[PDB]
Write a protein that binds this ligand. Structure first.
Ligand SMILES: Nc1ncnc2c1ncn2[C@@H]1O[C@H](COP(=O)(O)OP(=O)(O)OP(=O)(O)OP(=O)(O)OC[C@H]2O[C@@H](n3cnc4c(N)ncnc43)[C@H](O)[C@@H]2O)[C@@H](O)[C@H]1O
Ligand SMILES: Nc1nc2c(ncn2[C@@H]2O[C@H](COP(=O)(O)O)[C@@H](O)[C@H]2O)c(=O)[nH]1
Ligand SMILES: Nc1nc2c(ncn2[C@@H]2O[C@H](COP(=O)(O)O)[C@@H](O)[C@H]2O)c(=O)[nH]1
Ligand SMILES: [Mg+2]
Ligand SMILES: [Mg+2]
Lengths: 463, 463
């Protein structure tokens, strides 16, 4: 039972829109919208969406496995050893939001301050005392973004596991000698840094020049969660505001995926005529290049929707019906929709590129979709007696229970914590996502003008 | 009754070290250490101090007035009009942590997200609707550190008030024409940006080449809070750990100020021999250049304590008794004291340069001294019925009460909030200062191995 299984189960349910059934549905944590900072929905004039892992949620572990296989095949084709071909994706190893340290080849789970919560070299979990050889203060400098790479997205799950696989492989293969910062193979030295760059380049290649998109599209049911409730929610949003799409992907892929997401024998609800996905949006923008999009962005272009190619030149004209934009900046959306940032609720899955950057750079209201929350709530609920025991105790009893708690989620523990310690991801969700949920669909269960409320915060001296 | 009056009152009290009197004293908010993140004092091996506004707390409003007069005199001497000479410091205008917008000439009080809480152009407080002409989203981009200057320290109070004075003066003087981004004087255009740079340069000059230090030292009782309890606390810290000083000031000034702070007819307690201030520190470091100090720093130098000049060359030797260092980096302290960052509690008043940077860059434990908390607690306590009314209501009743609440603190409101909205300063204290208090002296009231406890934080879905 993966998190995507939970999501597809809820996707298969039709919307009962009776005002009392709606209120009772959003009782269950799976269907709730969680609130970090208060948000009056009545004040939202534009709803903005990301596509990948927001509107288009890819099924797990099938899609991660596909990305993993194609990345591995790319590395073998550029010269990596044949043994890579015997790796197989394991969804129980990676948790999202890990930090790869390119100096020492470790995956790290850290808190908001760079304190080490978990350290794995290959599949070898480094316990407290031994991590002090490499991390004397059990701490990393987060501002050292050249050394440390944060694996923010579900697209990073395959490389998270692959990095550990590769480190495990070269360490244990007797054709290589292990050094502090990489591997010797006779007269060739491969640093963990160049190994990571090869993996990163290979993932990029698979997305950009490889066959991931082609393979996805030739089996959409296998790879993509589909929900009849999506057209209904979008169409209700359009009744009270403007709706826009801003994706880092290209038009041709967006068009294939979005057509699939709206492919039902009806429109917003059963019995209504089907309408093209594009009709649900006041503005469609592809090749966004987020987060640069929230800074200077790039030159605004117009897509030729017939050929899927860009028209030559910068687009200088106004918003017209049926136009599709490419590139531009968040100011494009504001200018064209007549919107200020706080009038916008932007719904995304990328904590850095969608959420943190739109908040800091533009003062947009934010909604973070966390697909794994589907499963994480189940574990949180039915394993709460473990956490409660931990909360009670607050020494090597603490270490044992922290471990058992964590193991329930996988080898790298919960997305949100290690025992009583919150992860960097958890703190960034709290700091930057005004609202969050397992799915944006949970907005369907809240009335037109709901007021999401979070308690006022007091400083220690104010209590 | 200024905040420094409150502090000097407590300074005049002798330490009653009876274990029950200590426990009862730290009941009162004035004498408490507040806790943002848990800290086991037993784990602290080195206590580090800043000098200015930490150990040496300058009396208010006398010291701010002195800085203000000397800055004004510097501006007049470089060509600013004679009318500046009739300005007089007003301690009721500035609150610390305001943001000067160099584009439009406004002082802004903002929250952690760049949302506008207060906007003053000169002495003209811009209400909601009118701020939208210049701030369409009632929001500033905090990452635009070229446009926005955050007035973090008590040293910035004189320029905070002076900036408002200057904008008020040129606006109302008919020899100048007001434009969006500054003032016309015939064929001369002075932008608010160049005006701010002149003020900034003039403050720097007063500190570096002017007579502020000379004037301070020729009247120390007038300008500097003195406390018999300081030698006692330092000497108790030295019993269980190492103690160090890291100041951005120069040796000669540090030596004058520190001699004064320890000038009592006794040592740690009445009846004990007086000892030189330097004897209380295992390591003394001047010209620190914080926050650069917490990055690459500068070359480590040795002070010639006879002449007050630097010895020629980089100091390559070991920690020796009686040596005084200059420049260097935070790694100097760790290497010389055999300390890891989490073994260090660093006590400072600069939220950015002492606290935020030592936390993020080095994983130091942090203690923020907030001198105004002395007065702010009094207002918080005896005006709590106003805040409580506000908390109850949570529309133009909200606006009225927010205003009346704020006015109790001064024209720019509390350091920590505007009504129910927390300031950027408040959020940075919570995020970056593990402990905080009105004075570092409050540590005297806590046992050798106290455990400061903050409640574990839960995400909305975890509650
Ligand atoms: N998940 C992720 N994956 C990959 N990368 C990620 C990531 N999350 C974050 N990053 C990037 O990692 C680097 C370090 O991250 P962080 O350490 O997270 O920077 P921050 O979250 O924004 O904290 P800070 O309180 O200083 O920020 P603020 O907006 O207040 O500061 C705004 C500006 O004002 C300055 N500033 C802030 N407070 C100040 C003060 N009190 N005085 C003077 N200057 C101040 C700051 O130095 C800054 O220049 C950054 O480049 C960040 O964008
Ligand atoms: N080149 C590259 N593209 C990525 C990577 N991760 C996600 N993408 C692309 O980002 C797009 C998703 O954008 P979204 O709709 O989420 O803004 C997809 O086209 C996907 O292929 C990556 O690691 N490298
Ligand atoms: N040049 C300059 N020096 C300052 C300014 N503010 C504080 N200082 C200096 O900083 C030193 C205080 O450093 P601390 O002991 O607080 O680290 C003092 O010498 C003081 O003159 C400023 O705005 N400009
Ligand atoms: Mg996405
Ligand atoms: Mg200081």
């Amino acid at each position: 039972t993966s998190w995507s299984d939970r999501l597809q189960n809820a996707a298969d349910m039709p919307a009962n829109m009776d005002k009392h059934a709606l209120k009772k549905y959003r009782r269950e944590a799976y269907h709730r919208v969680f609130v970090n900072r208060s948000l009056a929905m009545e004040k939202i004039k534009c709803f903005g969406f990301n596509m990948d892992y927001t509107l288009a949620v890819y099924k797990s572990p099938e899609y991660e496995s596909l990305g993993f296989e194609l990345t591995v095949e790319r590395l073998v084709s550029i010269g990596y050893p044949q043994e890579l071909l015997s790796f197989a994706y394991d969804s129980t190893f990676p948790t999202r939001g890990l930090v790869f340290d390119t100096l020492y080849g470790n995956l790290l789970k850290v808190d908001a301050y760079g304190n080490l919560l978990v350290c794995a070299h290959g599949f070898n979990f480094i316990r407290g005392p031994e991590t002090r050889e490499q991390y004397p203060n059990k701490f990393i400098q987060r501002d050292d973004t050249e050394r440390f790479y944060i694996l923010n997205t579900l697209f990073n799950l395959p490389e998270t596991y692959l990095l550990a696989c590769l480190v495990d492989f070269f360490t244990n293969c007797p054709r290589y000698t292990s050094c502090e910062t990489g591997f010797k193979d006779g007269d060739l030295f491969m640093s963990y840094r160049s190994m990571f760059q090869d993996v990163r380049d290979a993932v990029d290649w698979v997305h950009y020049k490889g066959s991931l998109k082609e393979k996805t599209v030739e089996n959409l049911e296998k790879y993509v969660v589909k929900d009849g409730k999506l057209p209904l929610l979008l169409s209700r949003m359009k009744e009270v505001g403007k709706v826009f799409l801003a994706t880092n992907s290209d038009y041709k892929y967006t068009d294939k995926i979005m057509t699939y997401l709206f492919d039902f024998p009806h429109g917003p609800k059963p019995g209504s005529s089907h309408r093209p996905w594009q009709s649900y949006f006041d503005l469609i923008l592809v090749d966004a290049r987020k987060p640069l999009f929230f800074g200077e962005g790039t030159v605004l272009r117009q897509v030729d929707t017939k050929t899927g190619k860009l028209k030559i030149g910068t687009y200088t004209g106004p918003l017209q019906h049926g136009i599709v934009y490419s590139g531009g900046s968040s100011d494009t959306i504001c200018d064209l929709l007549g919107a200020k940032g706080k009038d916008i609720l932007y719904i995304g899955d990328h904590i850095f590129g969608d959420i943190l950057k739109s908040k800091k750079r533009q003062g947009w209201r934010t909604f973070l979709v966390i697909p794994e929350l589907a499963q994480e709530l189940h574990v949180w609920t039915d394993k709460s007696s473990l956490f409660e025991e931990l909360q009670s105790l607050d020494q090597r009893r603490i270490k044992k229970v922290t471990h058992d708690m964590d193991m329930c989620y996988g080898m790298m523990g919960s997305l949100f914590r290690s025992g009583s310690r919150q992860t960097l991801f958890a703190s960034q969700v709290m700091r930057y996502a005004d609202l969050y949920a397992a799915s944006f669909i949970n907005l369907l269960y809240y009335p037109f003008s709901y007021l999401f409320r979070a308690a006022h915060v007091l400083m220690p001296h104010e209590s």
